[PDB]
Symmetry: D2
Subunit: 115 residues, 4 copies
């Protein structure tokens, strides 16, 4: 599993459950091409987005649908979504985790790149 996403909620102190996540890859013409998608689990995690075969080097965008998340909780949020854009490079380690911590007016994100 080369690409995982984990999302936490800083207001409730819990995983962010049932958040839609869409991943895109940058195409040669500079447009965003759909690549993978899913909803986070009870543990705030999304696995099995892709295989090693399909996950080639390039620029990827992970879009997290935070607006729908907050509204479903009755909270008015600031952002239209949260977007994480990065380069996958074969020289570095091969397993990528994109982790995000959400609040209504703020978010933080880090990368954990292993083995």
């Amino acid at each position: 599993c080369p690409l995982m996403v984990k999302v936490l909620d800083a207001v409730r102190g819990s995983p962010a459950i049932n958040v839609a996540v869409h991943v895109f890859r940058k195409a040669a013409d500079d447009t965003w091409e759909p690549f993978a998608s899913g909803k986070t689990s009870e543990s705030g995690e999304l696995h099995g987005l892709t295989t090693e075969e399909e996950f080639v080097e390039g620029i990827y965008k992970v879009e997290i649908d935070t607006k729908s998340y907050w509204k479903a909780l009755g909270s008015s949020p600031f952002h239209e979504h949260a977007e994480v854009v990065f380069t996958a490079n074969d020289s570095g380690p091969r397993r990528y985790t994109i982790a995000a911590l959400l609040s209504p007016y703020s978010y933080s994100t880090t990368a954990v790149v292993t083995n």
Copy 2:
């Protein structure tokens, strides 16, 4: 000044100086139109992006050019940039500050919104 950006550097314990910032506004046709740009000062602050008159209601994208910042420091970072996308001024004019904290493999951003 209705739209400001302030950026700090978590590795140096200092303001993030000379960070390029580009702002876009979603157009009636649904693509990103260039709206304003600038770079942070020695205090890590960017003022004078726009005016009250020109900063009308819309969906704005503030793109903080984190990769160019780290690369100019000779460091290889993870992200291409940090984007903050939000609806602005839909309840009348407000003043917005986007505050950010940068590390090579992480960033945090928050918004400070003032005014009736």
Copy 3:
């Protein structure tokens, strides 16, 4: 002003106002001695904690009273407080800003250090 604190609120998208801050200094006997205290203003900023003369070399603890802040807003938070502990002025006088971002179950803090 050689020691300042600035605090933002991630839930309201605003400065964190009326946050109590207590600073302690480790004493020759190795316990925490009270050093200074204050509360943040409407801009989320706390100035005037100490003076250049009194802010000598040592190990300082800046305790940001996050629980009292959230409880005064009628919210039940997780942490008792946020502590930032650091050696100061060991290479001569510097100016320090401790910047923090608060949510009910999370906080972030960073330091900005200026001067030769």
Copy 4:
């Protein structure tokens, strides 16, 4: 496992490995009483600190030895350590994860409290 700690490194984009962590419980006289300790694993995680039996309600402090961590990497850090102080309450969910993201002049921490 009622109490877990997970530590990440924002400079390298990796787990924070082999970081000493000491947990204390507040005693009736307001002093900090040693409770549990360990070093984070290859995945930045520390498990098996305590049992449900010993983990009673009260105030706890999780001290992370970040200074030693950064110095072992050749980096001069700002903090003497990172401390996370919180109340364990039986009314809320029963599994606590304390997560921390480290940089030399900064750290962030959140709580993930589940089932």
